[PDB]
Design a protein around this nucleic acid. Structure first.
Ligand code: MG
Ligand code: ZN
Lengths: 175, 209, 848, 171, 50
RNA sequence: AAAGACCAGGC
DNA sequence: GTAAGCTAGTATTGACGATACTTGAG
DNA sequence: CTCAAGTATCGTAGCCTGGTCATTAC
């Protein structure tokens, strides 16, 4: 189910044939909740439009402001120390209670003591264009963990940042 | 009673219900058995036979109502797993007794595939039951219907009308509830008239096959 | 001979048995005729006018695209008055083969009368039909004689008519009923369409206006001459409509009574002539008035919407956070939301247009309007849906996340808005899950009717009413039934005759409500198809499933005639039955050193008291079971040689964590045969053999009953599994379920419920309690009782989906199931069983 | 744990490889079932107390303590004193090398190649194994949820570059 | 080019029973003035060796 | 020729 | 000759009925 | 020395009509 034909009946059929997504399954007809909307589709896949034949729910359509991320080619691990991240030492004798673990694409690269300053400083340095724009930072309070993602294939969307939103008044409303 | 539980033995009560079930099935089959040997309480049963009753002091049952030579017995059993040598020895003493035309073997926990062929050779017609099938009377249930067996002449007169040869009829199997409750052989034909608001005034005829 | 596919459109002004055929189709299809006497000149006219396409004299097919002698074959083109037969492609259309008379037009479609939509189950939204053209003359006779519309007028699935007044005709009759009188000009304009003459006016002169007819005199303009019949709400005498009582709740039934009066005494085609005169009259009546609907029809007021929202936030939302946490048996939700929906429908039928455009008594069509005007209702639940419970938990957490403005202000599965005012994005996602589940259930789930129809036709194909009248199989020549109907004999003819294929009619009358139920996929139409599959798909081999172990227990009536004493007997037997084990009371397992190692099973003090258990009870109920298990199956169980038990209300050993400090109840145990030189193997035996078998010991109740819950029943089904007891309706029942480890062969669950109910059996209604599954009733009560119960269950399930199916097909199905001797199913396990156990050639013509 | 190379798959399982055994921990690395305590002492840990420090049980939870002492006294029931110098490492030599299609490497280069690529020292690989076992024990006690593959935070989307790379490697 | 159709003036009314079962009725004069008038081009292809 | 593969319309 | 480099070597979305095997014990 | 059974697999699981393409050379 990988390569399809491009339709040219009107320009809208060509537009929506280029914005599809598929979950391929083994025997079509016995799947789990694959055919249903999940609440993690919000803002990134349409929960109203889908086929009704055998591919009901298995083929999705991108939302309007939806973006697929791409791989970041610059190294990012050495600029994490500037926000309050420390090394992972080699003694296997020292305990690390209270510290949160940081994980870059699943690889454990360090710890951080204060996690509600590390994340808020990484996010502030991303909003001033010295960290890459497609970098995902997730703080996890229950698992005591900070996950960072820079790989390809993640679904993104734009949002307004409220605390920087007062910087329009002083600007000029040119488009 | 609204919240009463009987603080007595259950096994005497089980043998009580099973023995009155055996008596009921003989009386509704047609043989003459004593009234109020059915209709007696649980309490006077416990007075006459106890709370943990012995099985060989059973009710050796009676003979036919209109006929004389057709007589029958019952045989109760012990709790544990059974071997057919017991059944052959008790059958030797049964045929030594006076005369019968059969008996009802009420078993307890198991019958053996070696047993049914080793009771098949005996000189009368006996039945095998189960002690836990004989608690509720199935012909006292509300959904039960009459199964009046018709005579051999009425079987001939029904086969007269439709020009049929008894294996083109609808059947009822012999390992059925009412078929063993009345002890019917293969080839008899029974009728049943249905009451019920979609099948009222509807009768059926089945051949035991 | 030939076939043709085309798009259908409608036409109300031609006759019911007429079909309009496009000219491009008609001029390329031929009919063959054998030229002989009485048609030399009539066919010569046709060949002179170049209307015969082809010819064959002898065998050599010479074309004409020649004079006529008697004895060759002319192939002429389709013209007005011929007979074709129509069929929508029979995906579900099992009985839709109709014979129609041809007229020709210039357009591209096939035109049919709008009364023929329901006999074909078609509509005009893109449907195509196939027309077939009969060439042989005996085929023309068979088509004209078996499948004409006047021949097929009374249905063979139900007892009703295949022709019913529908959408615009019924609306025209309703608006003709709400105003009663008509002036002279419109009455004479309508009288132009009647087949009879217009009567004198009912009102000759008022001082206000001129003369005026009533609408009964207009409706009588379609009758035949000298008609005099009678039904429920009408009296017709002397071809005059004398009486017709008020209603809109009765009107369609009164029209059906008038048509069945005409077709019981009037002619060879008079009911069709009645329809052919009535329908264009009603169209021409409605046309100078119009009928529409505005936004005012769809806008409930602010007051009534406030009452709807107040009834929701008062009643529905605090209950739905209680009884949904319980299991499936609490459908009180549906009754309460149906009460609020009744309130909404009573509000919305104040608008005059909306009450004329629906069927008020219908409920599937009245829920759809409540969803538009008022609330949508329940959209998410985790009972018998095709999605899992993790989706429902994710949606509840997402409901907490998105309504950060005062979360838990209602429930997450209830939508409060309407379609007319618009949904939230959250309500749209919740509604979209429910819509997706209905769509998937309607598309993927059309394989069980597809299997059922195949296995139904495979067994019911060759069952015919014979020439002597007995319903018989023909491949084995065995009697399935002695009579098909109850009043059919050789003096009185009936709806069915000799040679009728009653097995195929039963199979199609069974397959129609299944396909209708799955194509709807409502909760009611899902439950009905479940109840139908539980009868039609029984299995002759024992599968010991969940329903096979279920038993319904009834109770007696009126301890000493005191109030509130039947529920006491119910819990008396429940407290005797219900299983609770030692691990349901254990909290910790503490091994002690003081021979040397001594185990301490610790307990909970409170749940002993809340269930009335003492500790000597637990010692007895452990000791008897452990001595039985060291007696039964004697190998690898010699760990209980001289193992010891002991009991105490208080031990207070209190290992390192979660102390109760006093009267933590304890079952100490030990061992004495394990004279070991090491403690490490003693810890293995006391923590890996004894402690497993001492946890699953049951202390109160019977060890074989898995569950025994109490249901109030009283489902206004009036004893759903009882037939003749009383006019009582409110009995409480126990639904006992046995553990899987005890039922080995079929019929065991009744045997172990009655034997475990034995010390309390003086309270249970012995003559009424039954199992739940139909094969278990067959094992308990016999084959005739199973036959009657299968009829009684199949009738209820089929009457919930499609109303009025005749009893003859159901009784034939239940007779064919139980004809082998034991009740079989319509699957492979039943089919191979009987297969292993086991018109044409009806008459002959000749000369005289 | 998955990665690019098919020789990088690493599984920790909590099950009964057998009465009524306590559930123990097993490692499926390089198609070879190894006890996890042997792999702990092979990677360079010195004591059982610092190994259960590497797991960091968060206290209590007697099922976790029962499983770790069962895995210890099952590790001791397979190798005779694996804690002594290079006994466990020799054990994983003879356990890796006897498989179908053994890798062309000694075990030290096998660990530096196919065990957790992206980490530097064997100390860090022992710490990562302790974190993995902590995640399993936290899911066991009901404090963590299992992953469902319908939540799109567990999914990546492959377009023309990802598909064309895979197609071009074959040809 | 996201929208492909016309703006038609719609009435909601019965028309002699000709718009039942989801049928519609159209205007002759609106169609003759060019509403919903369509052009269609089909291509027929063939090949030979050279 | 025959099958695969796709799409659409129904059921 | 293709067997589908060797390719893994279990190490990732299906899930039930339906038929066929290696136990203990009368 | 055989039933049952606890796995061990097999194999079908929506179905039918339309229109279309593109079909390993060795
Ligand atoms: Mg349609
Ligand atoms: Zn204690």
């Amino acid at each position: 189910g990988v390569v399809a034909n491009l339709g040219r009946a009107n320009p809208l059929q060509s537009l929506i044939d280029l914005r599809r997504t598929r979950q391929q399954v083994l025997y079509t007809g016995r799947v789990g909740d694959a055919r249903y909307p999940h609440p993690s589709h919000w803002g990134r896949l349409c929960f109203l439009s889908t086929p009704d034949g055998e591919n009901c729910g298995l083929v999705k359509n991108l939302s309007l402001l939806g973006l697929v991320s791409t791989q970041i080619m610059e190294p990012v691990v050495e600029e994490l120390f500037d926000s309050g991240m420390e090394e992972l030492m080699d003694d296997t004798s020292t305990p690390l209670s209270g510290k949160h673990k940081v994980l870059l694409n699943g690889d454990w690269v360090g710890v951080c003591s204060d996690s509600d300053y590390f994340v808020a400083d990484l996010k502030s340095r991303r909003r001033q264009s010295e960290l890459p724009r497609q970098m995902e930072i997730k703080l996890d309070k229950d698992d005591k963990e900070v996950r960072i993602f820079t790989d390809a294939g993640r679904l993104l969307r734009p949002l307004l940042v409220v605390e920087n939103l007062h910087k329009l008044k002083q600007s000029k409303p040119s488009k | 009673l609204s919240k009463y539980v009987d603080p007595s033995s259950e096994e005497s009560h089980r043998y009580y219900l099973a023995r009155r079930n055996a008596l009921e099935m003989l009386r509704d089959r047609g043989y003459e058995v004593s009234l109020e040997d059915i209709n007696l309480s649980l309490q006077d049963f416990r007075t006459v036979y106890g709370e943990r009753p012995d099985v060989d002091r059973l009710r050796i049952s009676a003979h036919h109502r209109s006929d004389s030579s057709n007589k029958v017995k019952v045989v109760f059993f012990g709790t544990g797993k059974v071997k057919v040598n017991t059944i052959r020895s008790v059958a030797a003493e049964i045929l030594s007794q006076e005369t019968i035309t059969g008996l009802i073997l009420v078993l307890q926990n198991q019958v053996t595939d070696k047993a049914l062929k080793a009771i098949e050779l005996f000189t009368f017609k006996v039945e095998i039951f189960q002690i836990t099938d004989l608690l509720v009377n199935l012909t006292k249930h509300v959904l039960s219907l009459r199964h009046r067996v018709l005579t051999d002449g009425e079987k001939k007169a029904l086969l007269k009308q439709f020009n049929i040869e008894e294996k083109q009829l609808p059947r009822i199997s012999k390992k059925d509830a009412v078929v063993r409750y009345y002890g019917l052989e293969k080839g008899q034909i029974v009728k049943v008239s249905y009451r019920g608001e979609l099948t009222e005034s509807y009768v059926a005829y089945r051949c035991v096959w | 001979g030939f076939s043709s596919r085309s798009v259908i459109t409608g036409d109300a002004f031609r006759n019911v048995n007429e079909v309009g055929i496009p000219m491009e189709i008609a001029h390329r299809i031929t009919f063959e005729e054998r030229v002989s006497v009485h048609n030399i000149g009539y066919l010569q006219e046709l060949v002179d006018n170049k209307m015969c396409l082809s010819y064959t004299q002898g065998s050599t097919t010479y074309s004409l695209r020649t004079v006529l002698k008697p004895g060759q074959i002319v192939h002429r083109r389709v013209m007005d008055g011929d007979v074709v037969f129509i069929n929508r492609p029979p995906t579900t259309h099992k009985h839709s083969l109709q014979a129609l008379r041809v007229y020709v037009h210039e357009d591209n479609t096939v035109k049919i009368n709008p009364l023929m939509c329901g006999p074909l189950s078609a509509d005009f939204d893109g449907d195509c039909v196939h027309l077939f053209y009969p060439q042989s003359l005996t085929a023309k006779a068979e088509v004209l004689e078996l499948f004409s519309v006047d021949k097929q007028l009374r249905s063979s699935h139900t007892g009703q008519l295949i022709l019913q007044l529908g959408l615009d005709s019924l609306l025209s009759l309703r608006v003709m009923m709400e105003q009663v009188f008509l002036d002279k000009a419109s009455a004479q304009q309508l009288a132009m369409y009647g087949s009879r003459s217009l009567p004198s006016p009912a009102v000759v002169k008022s001082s206000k206006s001129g003369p005026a007819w009533t609408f009964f005199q207009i409706l009588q303009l379609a009758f035949p001459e000298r008609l005099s019949c009678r039904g429920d709400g009408f009296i017709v005498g002397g071809s005059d409509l004398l009486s017709f009582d008020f209603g809109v709740d009765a009107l369609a039934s009164i029209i059906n009574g008038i048509v069945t009066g005409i077709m019981v005494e009037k002619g060879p085609k008079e009911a069709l002539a009645f329809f052919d005169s009535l329908q264009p009259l009603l169209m021409e009546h409605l046309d100078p008035q119009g009928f529409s609907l505005s936004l005012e029809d769809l806008s409930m007021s602010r007051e009534d919407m406030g009452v709807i929202h107040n009834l929701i936030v008062r009643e529905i939302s605090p209950m739905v956070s209680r009884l949904r946490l319980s299991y499936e048996d609490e459908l009180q939700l549906e009754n309460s939301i149906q009460k609020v929906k009744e309130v909404a429908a009573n509000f919305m039928l104040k608008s005059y247009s909306m009450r004329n455009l629906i069927d008020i008594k219908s409920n599937s069509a009245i829920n759809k309007l409540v969803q538009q005007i008022g609330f949508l209702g329940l959209q998410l639940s985790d009972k018998k849906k095709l999605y899992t419970k993790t989706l429902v938990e994710d949606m509840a957490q997402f409901y907490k996340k998105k309504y950060v403005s005062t979360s838990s202000s209602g429930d997450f599965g209830i939508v409060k808005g309407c379609f007319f005012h618009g949904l939230d994005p959250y309500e749209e996602m919740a509604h979209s899950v429910a819509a997706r589940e209905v769509i998937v259930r309607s598309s993927r789930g059309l394989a069980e009717p597809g299997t059922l129809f195949k296995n139904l036709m495979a067994v019911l194909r060759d069952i015919v009413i014979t020439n002597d009248g007995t319903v018989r199989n023909t491949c084995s020549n065995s009697i399935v039934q002695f009579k098909y109907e109850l009043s059919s004999d050789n003096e009185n003819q009936g709806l069915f005759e000799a040679g009728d294929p009653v097995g195929v009619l039963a199979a199609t009358a069974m397959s129609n409500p299944a396909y209708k139920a799955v194509l709807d996929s409502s909760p009611n139409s899902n439950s009905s198809w479940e109840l139908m599959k539980e009868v039609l798909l029984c299995k002759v081999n024992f599968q010991n499933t969940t329903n096979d172990r279920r038993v319904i227990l009834y109770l007696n009536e009126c301890r000493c005639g005191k109030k509130y004493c039947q529920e006491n007997s119910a819990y008396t037997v429940r407290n005797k039955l219900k299983k609770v084990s030692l691990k349901d009371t254990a909290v910790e397992f503490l091994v002690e050193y003081r021979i040397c190692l001594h185990g301490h099973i610790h307990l909970n003090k409170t749940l002993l008291e809340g269930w009335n258990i003492s500790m000597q009870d637990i010692l007895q109920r452990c000791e008897d079971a452990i001595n039985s298990l060291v007696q039964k199956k004697k190998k690898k169980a010699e760990d209980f040689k001289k193992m010891n038990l002991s009991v105490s209300e208080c031990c207070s050993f209190r290992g390192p964590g979660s102390s109760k400090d006093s009267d933590m109840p304890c079952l100490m145990f030990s061992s004495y045969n394990a004279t070991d030189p090491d403690l490490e193997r003693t810890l293995d035996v006391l923590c890996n053999t004894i402690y497993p078998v001492l946890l699953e010991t049951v202390i109160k109740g019977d060890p074989r009953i898995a569950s025994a819950n109490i249901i109030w029943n009283s489902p206004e089904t009036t004893t759903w599994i009882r037939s003749l007891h009383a006019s009582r309706r409110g009995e409480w029942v126990l639904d006992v379920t046995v553990e899987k480890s005890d039922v080995k062969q079929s019929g065991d669950a009744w045997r172990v419920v009655i034997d475990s109910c034995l010390s309390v059996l003086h309270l249970i209604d012995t003559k009424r309690s039954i199992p739940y599954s139909i094969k278990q009733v067959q094992e308990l009560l016999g084959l005739s009782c199973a036959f009657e119960q299968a009829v009684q269950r199949l009738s209820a399930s089929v009457r919930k989906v499609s109303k009025g199916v005749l009893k003859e097909h159901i009784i034939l199905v239940a007779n064919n199931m139980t004809c082998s001797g034991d009740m079989l199913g319509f699957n492979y396990g039943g089919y191979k069983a009987l297969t292993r156990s086991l018109t044409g050639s009806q008459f002959e013509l000749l000369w005289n | 744990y998955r990665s690019e190379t098919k020789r990088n798959r690493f599984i920790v399982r909590l099950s009964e490889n057998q009465k009524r055994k306590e559930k123990v921990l097993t490692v499926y690395f390089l198609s070879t079932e190894i006890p996890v305590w042997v792999l702990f002492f092979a990677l360079g840990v010195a004591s059982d107390k610092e190994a259960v420090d590497l797991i960091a049980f968060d206290g209590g939870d007697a099922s976790i303590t029962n499983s770790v002492v069962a895995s210890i006294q099952e590790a001791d029931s397979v190798c005779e004193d694996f804690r002594h110098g290079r006994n466990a490492l020799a054990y994983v030599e003879q356990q890796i090398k006897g498989t179908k299609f053994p890798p062309g490497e000694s075990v030290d280069e096998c660990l530096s190649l196919y065990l957790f690529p992206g980490l530097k020292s064997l100390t860090q690989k022992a710490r990562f194994l302790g974190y993995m076992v902590k995640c399993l024990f936290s899911a066991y006690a009901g404090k963590r949820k299992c992953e469902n593959r319908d939540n799109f935070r567990n999914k990546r989307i492959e377009l023309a570059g990802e598909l064309l790379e895979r197609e071009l490697r074959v040809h | 080019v996201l929208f492909n159709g016309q703006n038609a003036i719609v009435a909601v009314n019965v028309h002699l029973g000709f718009n039942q079962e989801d049928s519609i009725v159209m205007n002759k004069a609106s169609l003759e003035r060019g509403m919903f008038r369509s052009e269609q081009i089909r291509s027929y292809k063939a090949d030979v060796d050279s």
